[PDB]
mmCIF file of C-alpha atoms and ligand atoms in Angstrom:
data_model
loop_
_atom_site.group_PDB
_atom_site.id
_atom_site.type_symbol
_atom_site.label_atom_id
_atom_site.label_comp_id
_atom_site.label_asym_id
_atom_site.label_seq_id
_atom_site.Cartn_x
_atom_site.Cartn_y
_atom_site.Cartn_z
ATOM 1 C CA UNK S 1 -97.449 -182.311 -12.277
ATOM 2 C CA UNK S 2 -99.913 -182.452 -15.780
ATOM 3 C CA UNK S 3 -101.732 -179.864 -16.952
ATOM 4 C CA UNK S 4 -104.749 -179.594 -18.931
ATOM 5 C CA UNK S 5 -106.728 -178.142 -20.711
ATOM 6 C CA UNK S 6 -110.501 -177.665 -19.871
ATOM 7 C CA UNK S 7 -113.007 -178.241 -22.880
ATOM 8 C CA UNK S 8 -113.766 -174.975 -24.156
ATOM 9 C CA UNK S 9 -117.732 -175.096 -23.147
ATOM 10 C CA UNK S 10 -116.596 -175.388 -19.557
ATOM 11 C CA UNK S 11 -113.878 -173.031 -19.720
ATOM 12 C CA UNK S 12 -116.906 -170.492 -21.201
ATOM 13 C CA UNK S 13 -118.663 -171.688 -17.765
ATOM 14 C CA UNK S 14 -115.788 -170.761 -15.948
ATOM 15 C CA UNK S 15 -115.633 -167.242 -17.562
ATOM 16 C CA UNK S 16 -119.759 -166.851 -17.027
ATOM 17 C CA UNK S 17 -119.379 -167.391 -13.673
ATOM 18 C CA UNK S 18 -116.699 -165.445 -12.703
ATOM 19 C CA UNK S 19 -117.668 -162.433 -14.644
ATOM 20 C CA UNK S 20 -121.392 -162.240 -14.622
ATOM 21 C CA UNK S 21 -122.419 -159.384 -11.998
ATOM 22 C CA UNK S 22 -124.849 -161.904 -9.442
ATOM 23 C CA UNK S 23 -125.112 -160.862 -5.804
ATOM 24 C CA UNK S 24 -126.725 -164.093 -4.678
ATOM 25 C CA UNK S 25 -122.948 -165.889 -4.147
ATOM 26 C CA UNK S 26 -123.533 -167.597 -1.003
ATOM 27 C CA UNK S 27 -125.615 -171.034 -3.329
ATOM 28 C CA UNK S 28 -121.856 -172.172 -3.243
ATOM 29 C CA UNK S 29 -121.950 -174.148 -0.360
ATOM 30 C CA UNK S 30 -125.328 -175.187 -1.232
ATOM 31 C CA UNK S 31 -123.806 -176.990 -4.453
ATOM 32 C CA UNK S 32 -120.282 -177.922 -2.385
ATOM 33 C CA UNK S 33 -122.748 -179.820 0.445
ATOM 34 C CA UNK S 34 -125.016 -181.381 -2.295
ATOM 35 C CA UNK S 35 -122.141 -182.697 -4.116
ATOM 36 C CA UNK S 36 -120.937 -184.487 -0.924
ATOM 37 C CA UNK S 37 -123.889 -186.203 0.165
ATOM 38 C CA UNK S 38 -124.316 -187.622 -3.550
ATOM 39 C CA UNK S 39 -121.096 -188.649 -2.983
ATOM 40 C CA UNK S 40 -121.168 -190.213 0.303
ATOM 41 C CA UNK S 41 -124.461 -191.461 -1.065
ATOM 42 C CA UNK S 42 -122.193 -193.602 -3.570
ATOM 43 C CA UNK S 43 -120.371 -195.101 -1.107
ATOM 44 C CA UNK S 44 -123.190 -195.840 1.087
ATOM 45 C CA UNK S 45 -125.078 -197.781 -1.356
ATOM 46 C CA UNK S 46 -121.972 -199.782 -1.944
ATOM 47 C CA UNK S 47 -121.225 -200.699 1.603
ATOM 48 C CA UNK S 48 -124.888 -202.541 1.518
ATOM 49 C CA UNK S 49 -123.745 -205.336 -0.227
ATOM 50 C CA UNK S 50 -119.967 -205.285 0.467
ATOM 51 C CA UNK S 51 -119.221 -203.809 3.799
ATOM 52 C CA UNK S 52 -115.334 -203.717 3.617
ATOM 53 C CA UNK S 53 -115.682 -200.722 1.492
ATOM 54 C CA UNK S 54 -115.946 -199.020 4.404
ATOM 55 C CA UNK S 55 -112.794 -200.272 6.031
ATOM 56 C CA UNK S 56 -110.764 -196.933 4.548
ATOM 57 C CA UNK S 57 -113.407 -195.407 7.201
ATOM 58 C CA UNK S 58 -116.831 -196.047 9.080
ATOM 59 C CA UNK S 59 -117.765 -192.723 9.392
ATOM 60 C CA UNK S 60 -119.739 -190.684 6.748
ATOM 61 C CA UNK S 61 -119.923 -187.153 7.275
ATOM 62 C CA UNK S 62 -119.176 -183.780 5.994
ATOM 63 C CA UNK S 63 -117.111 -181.008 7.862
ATOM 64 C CA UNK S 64 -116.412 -177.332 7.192
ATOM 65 C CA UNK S 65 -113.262 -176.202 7.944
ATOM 66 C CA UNK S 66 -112.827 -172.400 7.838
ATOM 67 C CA UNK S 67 -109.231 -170.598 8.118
ATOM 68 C CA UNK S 68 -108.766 -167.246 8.634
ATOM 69 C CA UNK S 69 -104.860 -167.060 8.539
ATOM 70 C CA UNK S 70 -104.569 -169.163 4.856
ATOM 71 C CA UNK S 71 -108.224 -167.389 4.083
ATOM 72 C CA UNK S 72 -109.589 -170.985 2.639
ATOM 73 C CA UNK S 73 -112.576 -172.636 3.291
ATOM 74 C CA UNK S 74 -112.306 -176.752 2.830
ATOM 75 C CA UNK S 75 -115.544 -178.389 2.440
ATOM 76 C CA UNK S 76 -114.127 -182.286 3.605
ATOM 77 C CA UNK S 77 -116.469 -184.751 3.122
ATOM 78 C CA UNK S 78 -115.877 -189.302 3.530
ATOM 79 C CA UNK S 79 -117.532 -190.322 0.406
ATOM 80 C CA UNK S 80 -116.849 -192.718 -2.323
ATOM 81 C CA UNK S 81 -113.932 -190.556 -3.964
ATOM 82 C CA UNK S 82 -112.478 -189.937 -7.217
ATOM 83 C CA UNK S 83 -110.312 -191.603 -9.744
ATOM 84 C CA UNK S 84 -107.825 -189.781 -11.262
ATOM 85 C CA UNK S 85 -109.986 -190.295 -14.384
ATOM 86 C CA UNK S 86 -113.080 -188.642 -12.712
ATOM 87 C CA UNK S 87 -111.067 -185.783 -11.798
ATOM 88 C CA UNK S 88 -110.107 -185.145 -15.347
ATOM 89 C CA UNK S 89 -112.819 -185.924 -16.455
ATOM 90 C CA UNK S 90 -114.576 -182.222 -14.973
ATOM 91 C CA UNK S 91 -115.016 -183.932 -11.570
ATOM 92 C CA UNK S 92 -117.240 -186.747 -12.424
ATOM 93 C CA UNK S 93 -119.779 -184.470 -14.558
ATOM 94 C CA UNK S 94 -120.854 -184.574 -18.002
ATOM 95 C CA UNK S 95 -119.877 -181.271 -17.877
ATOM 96 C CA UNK S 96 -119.741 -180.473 -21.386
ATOM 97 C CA UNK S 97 -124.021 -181.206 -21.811
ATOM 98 C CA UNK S 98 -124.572 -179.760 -18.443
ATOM 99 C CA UNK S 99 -123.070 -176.455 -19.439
ATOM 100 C CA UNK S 100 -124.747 -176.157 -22.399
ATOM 101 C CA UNK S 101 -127.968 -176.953 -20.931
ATOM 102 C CA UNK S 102 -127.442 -174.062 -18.312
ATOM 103 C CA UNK S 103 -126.311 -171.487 -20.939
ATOM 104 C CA UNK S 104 -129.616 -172.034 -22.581
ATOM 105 C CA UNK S 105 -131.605 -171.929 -19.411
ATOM 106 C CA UNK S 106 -129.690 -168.438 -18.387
ATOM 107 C CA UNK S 107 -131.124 -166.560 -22.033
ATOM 108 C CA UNK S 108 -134.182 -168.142 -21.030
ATOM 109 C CA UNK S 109 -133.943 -166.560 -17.798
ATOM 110 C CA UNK S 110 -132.847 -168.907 -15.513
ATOM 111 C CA UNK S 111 -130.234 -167.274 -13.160
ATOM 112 C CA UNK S 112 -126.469 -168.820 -11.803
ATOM 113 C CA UNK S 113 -128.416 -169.824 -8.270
ATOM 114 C CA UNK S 114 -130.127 -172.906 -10.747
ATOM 115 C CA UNK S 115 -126.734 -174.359 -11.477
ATOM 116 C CA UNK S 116 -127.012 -177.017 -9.571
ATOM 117 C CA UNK S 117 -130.107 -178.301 -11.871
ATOM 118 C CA UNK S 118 -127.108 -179.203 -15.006
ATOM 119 C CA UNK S 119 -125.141 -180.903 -13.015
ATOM 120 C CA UNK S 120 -122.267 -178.693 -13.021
ATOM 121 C CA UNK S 121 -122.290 -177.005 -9.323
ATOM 122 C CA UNK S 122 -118.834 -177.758 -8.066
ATOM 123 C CA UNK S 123 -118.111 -174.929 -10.744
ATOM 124 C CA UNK S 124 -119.794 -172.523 -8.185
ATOM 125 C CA UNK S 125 -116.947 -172.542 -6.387
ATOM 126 C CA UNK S 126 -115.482 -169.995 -8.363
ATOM 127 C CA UNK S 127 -118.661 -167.198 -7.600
ATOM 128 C CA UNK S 128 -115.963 -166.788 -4.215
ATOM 129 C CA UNK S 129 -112.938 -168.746 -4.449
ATOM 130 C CA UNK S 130 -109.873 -167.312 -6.807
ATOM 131 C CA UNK S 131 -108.105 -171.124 -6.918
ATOM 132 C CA UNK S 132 -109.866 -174.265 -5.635
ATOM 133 C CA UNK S 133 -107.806 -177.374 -4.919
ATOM 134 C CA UNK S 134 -109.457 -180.735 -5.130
ATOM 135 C CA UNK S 135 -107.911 -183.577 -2.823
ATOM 136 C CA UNK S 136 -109.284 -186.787 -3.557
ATOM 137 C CA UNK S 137 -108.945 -190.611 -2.686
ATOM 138 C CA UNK S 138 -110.981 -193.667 -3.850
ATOM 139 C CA UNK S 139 -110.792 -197.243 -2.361
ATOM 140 C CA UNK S 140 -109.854 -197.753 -5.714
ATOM 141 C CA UNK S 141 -106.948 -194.975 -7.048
ATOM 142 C CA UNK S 142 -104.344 -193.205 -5.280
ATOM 143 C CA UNK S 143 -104.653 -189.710 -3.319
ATOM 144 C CA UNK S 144 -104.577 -186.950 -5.962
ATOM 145 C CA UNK S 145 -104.739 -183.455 -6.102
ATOM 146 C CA UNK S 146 -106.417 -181.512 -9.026
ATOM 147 C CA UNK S 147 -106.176 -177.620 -8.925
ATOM 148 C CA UNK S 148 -107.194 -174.281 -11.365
ATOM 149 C CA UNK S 149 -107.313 -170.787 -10.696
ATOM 150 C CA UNK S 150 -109.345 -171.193 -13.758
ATOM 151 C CA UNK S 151 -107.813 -169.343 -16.812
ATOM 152 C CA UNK S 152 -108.144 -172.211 -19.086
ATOM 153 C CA UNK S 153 -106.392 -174.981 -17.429
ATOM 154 C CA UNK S 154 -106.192 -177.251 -14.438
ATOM 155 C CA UNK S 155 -103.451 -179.737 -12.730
ATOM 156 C CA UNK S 156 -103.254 -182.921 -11.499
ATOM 157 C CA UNK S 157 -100.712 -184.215 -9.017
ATOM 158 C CA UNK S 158 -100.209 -187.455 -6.524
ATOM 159 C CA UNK S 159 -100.935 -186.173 -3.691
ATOM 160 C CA UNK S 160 -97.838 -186.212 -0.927
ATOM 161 C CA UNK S 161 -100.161 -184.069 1.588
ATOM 162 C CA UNK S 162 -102.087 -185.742 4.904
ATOM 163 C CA UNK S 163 -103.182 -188.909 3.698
ATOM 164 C CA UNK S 164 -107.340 -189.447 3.875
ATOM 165 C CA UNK S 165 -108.641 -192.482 4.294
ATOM 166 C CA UNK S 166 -111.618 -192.017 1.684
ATOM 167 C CA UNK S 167 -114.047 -189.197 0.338
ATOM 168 C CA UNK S 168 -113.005 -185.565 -0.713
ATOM 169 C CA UNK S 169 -111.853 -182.266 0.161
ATOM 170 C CA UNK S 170 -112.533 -178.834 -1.559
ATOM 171 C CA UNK S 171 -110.465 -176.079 -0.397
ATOM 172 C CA UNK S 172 -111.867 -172.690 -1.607
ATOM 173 C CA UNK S 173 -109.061 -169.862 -1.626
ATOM 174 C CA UNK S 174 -111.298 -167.388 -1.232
ATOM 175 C CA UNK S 175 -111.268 -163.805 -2.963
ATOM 176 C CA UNK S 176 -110.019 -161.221 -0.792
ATOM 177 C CA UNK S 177 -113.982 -159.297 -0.730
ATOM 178 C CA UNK S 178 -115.435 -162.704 0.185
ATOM 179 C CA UNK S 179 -114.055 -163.900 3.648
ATOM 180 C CA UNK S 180 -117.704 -163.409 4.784
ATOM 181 C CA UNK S 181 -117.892 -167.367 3.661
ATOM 182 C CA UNK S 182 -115.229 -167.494 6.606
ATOM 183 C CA UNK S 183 -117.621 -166.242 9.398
ATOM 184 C CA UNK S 184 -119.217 -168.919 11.795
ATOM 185 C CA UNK S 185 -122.244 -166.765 11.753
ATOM 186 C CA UNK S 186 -122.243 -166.869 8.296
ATOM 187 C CA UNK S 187 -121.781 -169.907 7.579
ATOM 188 C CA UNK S 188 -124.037 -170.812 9.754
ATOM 189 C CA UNK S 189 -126.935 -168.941 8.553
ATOM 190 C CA UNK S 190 -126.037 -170.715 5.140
ATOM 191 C CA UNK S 191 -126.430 -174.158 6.244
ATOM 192 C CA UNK S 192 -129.666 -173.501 8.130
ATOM 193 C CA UNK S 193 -131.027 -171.999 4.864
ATOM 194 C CA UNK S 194 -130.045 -174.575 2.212
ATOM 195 C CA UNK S 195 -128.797 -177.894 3.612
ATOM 196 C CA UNK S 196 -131.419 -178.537 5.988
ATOM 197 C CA UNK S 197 -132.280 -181.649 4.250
ATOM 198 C CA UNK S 198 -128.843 -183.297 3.603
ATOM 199 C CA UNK S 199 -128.399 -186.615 5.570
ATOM 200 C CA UNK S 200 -125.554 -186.179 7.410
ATOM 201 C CA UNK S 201 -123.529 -184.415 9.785
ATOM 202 C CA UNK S 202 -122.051 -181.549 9.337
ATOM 203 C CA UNK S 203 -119.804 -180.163 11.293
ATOM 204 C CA UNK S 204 -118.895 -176.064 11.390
ATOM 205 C CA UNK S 205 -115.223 -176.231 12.632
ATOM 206 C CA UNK S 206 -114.393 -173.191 14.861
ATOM 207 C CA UNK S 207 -110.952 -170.898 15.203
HETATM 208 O O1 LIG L 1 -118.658 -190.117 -9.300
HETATM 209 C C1 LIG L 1 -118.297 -189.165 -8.383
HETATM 210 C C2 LIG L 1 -118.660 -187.830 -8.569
HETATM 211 C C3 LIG L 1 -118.282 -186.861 -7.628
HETATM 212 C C4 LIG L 1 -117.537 -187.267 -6.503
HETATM 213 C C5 LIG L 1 -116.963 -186.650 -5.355
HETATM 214 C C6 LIG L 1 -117.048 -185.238 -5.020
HETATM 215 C C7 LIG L 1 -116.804 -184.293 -6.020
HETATM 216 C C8 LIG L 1 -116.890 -182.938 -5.708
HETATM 217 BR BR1 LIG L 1 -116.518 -181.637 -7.022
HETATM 218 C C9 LIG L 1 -117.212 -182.508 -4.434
HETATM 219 O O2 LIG L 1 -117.326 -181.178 -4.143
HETATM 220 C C10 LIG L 1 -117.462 -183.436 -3.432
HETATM 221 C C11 LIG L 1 -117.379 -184.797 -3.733
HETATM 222 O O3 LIG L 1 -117.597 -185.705 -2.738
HETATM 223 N N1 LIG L 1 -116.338 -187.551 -4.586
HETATM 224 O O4 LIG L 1 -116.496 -188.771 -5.226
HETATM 225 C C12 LIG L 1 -117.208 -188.602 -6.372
HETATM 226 C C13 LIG L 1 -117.559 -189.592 -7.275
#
């Protein structure tokens, strides 16, 4: 197991978001979703010109898997995947510009729900989740796992769990006043009101 240290600007993101007082919480998914369809974009557009990148799996697609008993949420999704480079590297982002472009847009007046916008959404997660564990595989890496419960710091492990073919999965440990996120209802209503758009399937698990 490594651990790291996040740069301090998105450590300062980290703190922003879990501190600032901002009802409008539920734009996590929103950004979780997005991030997955850009992703399964990626591997998409590959595929067009070499189709054995789809041989770790056909299938492109995004499910929602709530739990109740472990109170997580796992957003799963079969895109392109990340190295273990891209997960040190703040999930793929240039998270370092992005946060400072979103700091500047908040004393402007933006608000969090814009986050999205910089490039730096996955950090969402942490409006209702009090760890988030990132598994990961890319036709071209192993199966890792990165992990915070922010604080300054993040791991990164070979993954030993269920092996995935290819893509992504976010598992939100979700605070103990936000298992609302947990609710087919909810969730439901959430998807309806942001995702309309995205360009795949995705599928609300049930209990
Ligand atoms: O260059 C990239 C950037 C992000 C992702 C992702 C990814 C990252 C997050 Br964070 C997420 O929530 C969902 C994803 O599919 N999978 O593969 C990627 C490759």
């Amino acid at each position: 197991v490594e651990t790291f240290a996040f740069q301090a600007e998105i450590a300062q993101l980290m703190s922003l978001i879990i501190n600032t007082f901002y009802s409008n919480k539920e734009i996590f998914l929103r950004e979780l979703i997005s991030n997955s369809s850009d992703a399964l974009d990626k591997i998409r557009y590959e595929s067009l010109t070499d189709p054995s990148k789809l041989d770790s799996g056909k299938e492109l697609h995004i499910n929602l898997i709530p739990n109740k008993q472990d109170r997580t949420l796992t957003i799963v999704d079969t895109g392109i995947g990340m190295t273990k480079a891209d997960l040190i590297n703040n999930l793929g982002t240039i998270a370092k510009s992005g946060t400072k472009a979103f700091m500047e847009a908040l004393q402007a007046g933006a608000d969090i729900s814009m986050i999205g916008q910089f490039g730096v959404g996955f950090y969402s997660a942490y409006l209702v989740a009090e760890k988030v564990t990132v598994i990961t595989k890319h036709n071209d890496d192993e199966q890792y796992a990165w992990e915070s419960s922010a604080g300054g710091s993040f791991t990164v492990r070979t993954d030993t769990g269920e092996p995935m073919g290819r893509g992504t999965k976010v598992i939100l440990h979700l605070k103990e006043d936000q298992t609302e996120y947990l609710e087919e209802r909810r969730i439901k209503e959430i998807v309806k009101k942001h995702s309309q758009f995205i360009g795949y399937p995705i599928t609300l698990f049930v209990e």
